[PDB]
Amino acid sequence: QFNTRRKKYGTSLLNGNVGHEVLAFHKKLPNYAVTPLHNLAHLSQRLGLGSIHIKDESWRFGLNAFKGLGGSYAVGKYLADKLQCDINSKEKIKDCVFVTATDGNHGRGVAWAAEQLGLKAVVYMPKGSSLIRAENIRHHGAECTITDLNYDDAVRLAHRMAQTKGWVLLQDTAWTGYEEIPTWIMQGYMTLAVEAYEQLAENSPLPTHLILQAGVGSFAGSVMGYFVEKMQENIPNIIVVEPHQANCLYQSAVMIMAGLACGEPNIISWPIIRDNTSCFISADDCLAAKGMRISAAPRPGTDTPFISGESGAIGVGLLYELMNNMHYQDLARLQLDAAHVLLISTEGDTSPDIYEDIVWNGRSA
Amino acid sequence: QFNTRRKKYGTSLLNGNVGHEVLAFHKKLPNYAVTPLHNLAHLSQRLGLGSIHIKDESWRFGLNAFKGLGGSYAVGKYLADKLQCDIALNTPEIKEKIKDCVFVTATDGNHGRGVAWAAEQLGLKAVVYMPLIRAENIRHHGAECTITDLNYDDAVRLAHRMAQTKGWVLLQDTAWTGYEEIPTWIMQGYMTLAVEAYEQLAETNSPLPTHLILQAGVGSFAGSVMGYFVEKMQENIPNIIVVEPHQANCLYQSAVMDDGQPHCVTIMAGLACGEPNIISWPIIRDNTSCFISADDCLAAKGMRISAAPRPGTDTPFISGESGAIGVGLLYELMNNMHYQDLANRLQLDASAHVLLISTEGDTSPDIYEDIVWNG
């Protein structure tokens, strides 16, 4: 099941100077390395497409997800601003305590950055969060607590705690009046796009299509924002996909993927998403499960097998269905034909048990 | 769901001279090559086992299944006996003496393909009845192939009637009164995969099997393989487990009846047989330690496991519905807590070295993708 909604309203913060600041910063960090960009040429043939490339962020900073790019940059910028000096280069920042909510990857990123600086970090997770994701946050020395709240109330709690405790809210969504840090998070994500664009040029056709997954929209805004800025005159076809049960951007446009399970769009990324998305897709979980299995199990001869988690694989899963399920040849309107598609695998097996259960035992829900 | 039945009656045709004849023969054939034996050491760790090796017969002769070993050898032996000589690549003036030979069989796909392929090698005719891509692949060898409206067993009956009434040579991998010689040869021909596997383990200083897990349709393949290993490892005969689908568990059911005799039952297509082969039954009865019946999802599991090891690690390979039941069963045995007892009783632990045989690859690509990618 794919629900379609093309954008009537389709038609800077991700500019090249920010790009250079952000990349300059990440390159000085421990374990910085360009992540792989997998060319799924054999899958591209099997589906009738020009090219499929998937940016594999399961390698990013050893954290099994991309988000650290954001948290790190935002933490750096926050501290640079507290110390009044440029991103360029402890007594003055000893009492800094970061606080956030997370479904797992964001918090891990913040906890990791805090650990690098010997700063304290406090993390709240929603009811139902997997225990191993919390453990992995605690192993950076951060405090982590699985709450009895849903995601949005958990973001509320982190906010109330920053307000009542004097902690620095380090959250990857924005609402009116809490925008600077969210903006920096979005900006920090752009490194993966910069790397991907350069990896394609250094003689692969650039993207005709971008398929980008969304929780609150920060990641998608960052990535499409960048590609629009860099390909100003042939802005590629941008498809945004959410789970059926958490399709706020789809719904906004009408008016198990744990990382995407967010109800309130980020107000800083919304305009970039509204102005640039061509089609919003809502998708059943089994497409994410499919994508994980496709990524893991290319035919032995052929494309490189890799580890892509529940919120990371929804891209190939949607793409496969789009090009293979006959019920959607019409939709595939989206100009998918023998089209160069960039996807981003945003996480690896962030809960190994869930991953094995999907990829080996065939759970699709 | 695993159903258990350990064998009360547990306690030659697969001897080394036959082994040499059969291997001597297969080596002269086109595209003979030792098939890979995959060492799943990383899976072995993840499950708490000494070692897992899987013989990958998806490569065999380019046919995507092991069965050709049998059909070929049986065809050779039949022709050798018609031309009265002790067994290749023929004189065309002696083609005159074998021009009218026509092989006929029923198959769910692999057996027929093997017979059709051997017939094609000799420019002989072959006629095949099945109970769509599996049929096409049989036709491409130049054989006649017809999807019947009969079940597998009634299809075997049809092939039999046609041999009797047309003078064709029945080339079937199960047995009838007056019809044992060819079936026996089929069983014997299968042993090459076992000979290869055993040598591949020794020549890499790998421990020999403590366990064999062998899938069964009529029992010919399992009889051949366990027969060989019992003969070769006479002093430490390994623990032998035989697995069938729930819906086609005749050997299991035979063992439940406990009267020494084989008994009929009235996704794993190759294993879907109701009537045990009477030539392989005694080997099976005398040597099997436990009979297992298994749900289809274990075969599906095994296909996904085989296809998707973690990128760093074991070699990924293509294993089809009737070929992957082994690892599937094994995974469940070692991982589903409802079976730790059974596993312990079966002696599956970090001391156990398990040999499995992946009998086919993606013999229907659609079904395979649907299982491995879509679940």
Q: Give just the sign of the alpha carbon dihedral B335, B340, B346, B350.
A: positive
For A45, the token pair is: 């043939």
Quick one: three-class SS letters along chain B? CEEEEECCCCCCCCCHHHHHHHHHHHHHCCCCCCCCEEECHHHHHHHCCCEEEEEEHHHHHHCCECCHHHHHHHHHHHHHHHCCCCCCCCCHHHHHHHCCCEEEEECCCHHHHHHHHHHHHCCCEEEEEECCHHHHHHHCCCCEEEECCCCHHHHHHHHHHHHHHHCCEECCCCCECCECHHHHHHHHHHCHHHHHHHHHHHCCCCCCCCEEEEECCCCHHHHHHHHHHHHHCHHHCCEEEEEEEHHHCHHHHHHHHCCCCCCCCCCCHHHCCCCCCCCCHHHHHHHCCEEEEECHHHHHHHHHHHHCCCCCCCCCCCCCCCCCHHHHHHHHHHHCHHHHHHHHHCCCCCCCEEEEEECECCCCHHHHHHHHCCC
Are the C-beta atoms of residues B105 and B129 closer than 8 Å to each other? Answer: yes
- Contact at CB, A300 and B317, closer than 8 angstroms: yes
> Which residues in chain B touch residue A296, judged by CB atoms under 8 angstroms apart?
308, 311
- Interface with chain B: mutation pick from A46, A286, A293, highest number of B CBs within 10 Å: A293
Q: CA A18, CA A34: separation in Å to the nearest integer?
A: 18
Q: CA B23, CA B31: separation in Å to the nearest integer?
A: 13
- Give B27: exposed, middle or buried? Use CB within 10 Å, 0-12, 13-18, 19+: exposed
For B208, the token pair is: 């020999």
Are the C-beta atoms of residues B125 and B80 closer than 8 Å to each other? Answer: no
Q: Give just the sign of the alpha carbon dihedral A224, A225, A230, A233.
A: positive
**Pairing state of beta strands A143-146 and B353-358?**
unpaired
B129 shares its domain with B45: no
- Which residues of A are identified as catalytic? 67, 103
How far is B292 from chain A, CA to nearest CA, in Å?
20
Say whether residue B197 is in contact with chain A using an 8 A CB cutoff. Answer: no
Are the C-beta atoms of residues B51 and B74 closer than 8 Å to each other? Answer: no
Backbone angles phi, psi at A243, to 5 degrees: -70, 150
Closest listed residue to residue A73, CA positions, set A227, A225, A198, A182? A182
- Sequence-ordered alpha helix ranges (H) in chain A: 16-27, 41-47, 68-82, 105-116, 131-138, 151-165, 180-201, 218-230, 248-254, 270-276, 285-296, 314-324, 352-359
Closest listed residue to residue B101, CA positions, set B186, B185, B168, B172? B168
B146 shares its domain with B94: yes
Q: How many Cβ atoms sit within 10 Å of the Cβ of residue B178? A: 6
Method used for this model? X-ray
SS3 category, A59: helix
The rounded radius of gyration (Å) of the Cα atoms in chain A is 19
Q: Name every residue whose Cβ is closer than 8 Å to that of residue B234 and which is 6 or more positions away in sequence.
A: none
Identify the domain boundary among B112, B143, B178: B178
The rounded radius of gyration (Å) of the Cα atoms in chain B is 20
Distances (CA, A) of A119 to A30, A95, A110, A172, A185: 17, 8, 10, 19, 18
Backbone angles phi, psi at B212, to 5 degrees: -120, 130
Q: CA B185, CA B71: separation in Å to the nearest integer?
A: 8
Q: CA B187, CA B196: separation in Å to the nearest integer?
A: 16
Backbone angles phi, psi at A253, to 5 degrees: -70, -30
Which residue range(s) make up the domain with B103? Answer: 66-178
B362 shares its domain with B329: yes
> For chain A, what is the domain count?
2
Hey, which residues does B3 pair with through a beta bridge? B293
Distances (CA, A) of A319 to A66, A251, A291, B366: 21, 21, 9, 18
Q: How many Cβ atoms sit within 10 Å of the Cβ of residue A300? A: 13
- Contact at CB, B375 and A289, closer than 8 angstroms: yes
Say whether residue B316 is in contact with chain A using an 8 A CB cutoff. Answer: yes
- Give A186: exposed, middle or buried? Use CB within 10 Å, 0-12, 13-18, 19+: buried
Q: CA B323, CA B326: separation in Å to the nearest integer?
A: 7
Are the C-beta atoms of residues B375 and A364 closer than 8 Å to each other? Answer: yes
Backbone angles phi, psi at B237, to 5 degrees: -60, 125
> Could you confirm whether B99 is annotated as catalytic?
no
Distances (CA, A) of A314 to A289, A319, B311: 8, 8, 19
B91 shares its domain with B191: no
Q: CA B168, CA B103: separation in Å to the nearest integer?
A: 6
Q: CA A23, CA A191: separation in Å to the nearest integer?
A: 6
B120 shares its domain with B163: yes
Identify the domain boundary among B178, B207, B231: B178
For A32, the token pair is: 């910085």
**Pairing state of beta strands A97-101 and A120-125?**
parallel
> Could you confirm whether B67 is annotated as catalytic?
yes
Q: Name every residue whose Cβ is closer than 8 Å to that of residue A94 and which is 6 or more positions away in sequence.
A: none
Full DSSP string of A110-132: HHHHHHHTT-EEEEEE-TT--HH
For A310, the token pair is: 């529940």
Side-chain-side CA neighbours of residue A353 (13 Å):
5
- Give A235: exposed, middle or buried? Use CB within 10 Å, 0-12, 13-18, 19+: middle
Hey, which residues does A213 pair with through a beta bridge? A241
Side-chain-side CA neighbours of residue A153 (13 Å):
7
Say whether residue B337 is in contact with chain A using an 8 A CB cutoff. Answer: no
Identify the domain boundary among A177, A210, A235: A177
Closest listed residue to residue B334, CA positions, set B318, B319, B350, B355? B350
Q: CA B301, CA A24: separation in Å to the nearest integer?
A: 46
B220 shares its domain with B129: no
Are the C-beta atoms of residues A225 and A272 closer than 8 Å to each other? Answer: yes
Say whether residue A320 is in contact with chain B using an 8 A CB cutoff. Answer: yes
Side-chain-side CA neighbours of residue A249 (13 Å):
39
Q: CA B91, CA B187: separation in Å to the nearest integer?
A: 28
Q: How many Cβ atoms sit within 10 Å of the Cβ of residue B207? A: 13
Chain A residue with Cα closest to B375: A362
- Residue A26: DSSP 8-state: H
Say whether residue B311 is in contact with chain A using an 8 A CB cutoff. Answer: yes
Q: Give just the sign of the alpha carbon dihedral B92, B98, B101, B107.
A: negative
- Give A201: exposed, middle or buried? Use CB within 10 Å, 0-12, 13-18, 19+: exposed
Q: CA B82, CA B311: separation in Å to the nearest integer?
A: 53
Q: CA B192, CA B33: separation in Å to the nearest integer?
A: 11
Q: CA A104, CA A352: separation in Å to the nearest integer?
A: 13
Closest listed residue to residue A346, CA positions, set A106, A185, A127, A113? A106
Of B7, B55, B56, B67, catalytic: B67
A224 shares its domain with A331: yes
Could you tell me if residue B61 is left (phi over 0), alpha (psi between -120 and 50 degrees) or otherwise beta? left
For B115, the token pair is: 């017979």
B164 shares its domain with B206: no
Are the C-beta atoms of residues B122 and B79 closer than 8 Å to each other? Answer: yes
Kindly report the CATH number assigned to the domain that includes residue A222.
Answer: 3.40.50.1100
Closest listed residue to residue B238, CA positions, set B357, B347, B329? B347
- CB burial readout A80-95, b (16+ within 10 A) else e: eeeeeeebeeeeeeee
A157 shares its domain with A217: no
Hey, which residues does B125 pair with through a beta bridge? B102
Backbone angles phi, psi at A122, to 5 degrees: -125, 130
A10 shares its domain with A122: no
3-state helix, strand, coil in chain A (%, to 5): 45, 15, 40
B152 shares its domain with B271: no
How far is A192 from chain B, CA to nearest CA, in Å?
22
Q: CA B33, CA B28: separation in Å to the nearest integer?
A: 10
Say whether residue A362 is in contact with chain B using an 8 A CB cutoff. Answer: yes
Question: One-letter amino acid identity for B147?
Answer: I
Q: Name every residue whose Cβ is closer than 8 Å to that of residue B253 and which is 6 or more positions away in sequence.
A: B263, B265
Residues preceding chain discontinuities in chain A with C to N over 2.5 Å: 11, 89, 202, 255, 332, 338
> A with B: how many residue pairs have Cβ under 8 Å apart?
53
What is the resolution of the experimental data for this entry, in Å? 2.5
Question: One-letter amino acid identity for A20?
Answer: H
Please give the distance of CA A147 from its chain centroid, rounded to a whole number.
Answer: 23
How far is B89 from chain A, CA to nearest CA, in Å?
33
A264 shares its domain with A217: yes
Contacts 24+ apart (CB under 8 A), A226-233: A226/A14, A226/A19, A226/A190, A226/A193, A226/A194, A226/A197, A227/A193, A227/A197, A227/A342, A228/A14, A228/A272, A228/A276, A229/A12, A229/A14, A229/A15, A229/A16, A230/A16, A230/A197, A231/A206, A231/A207
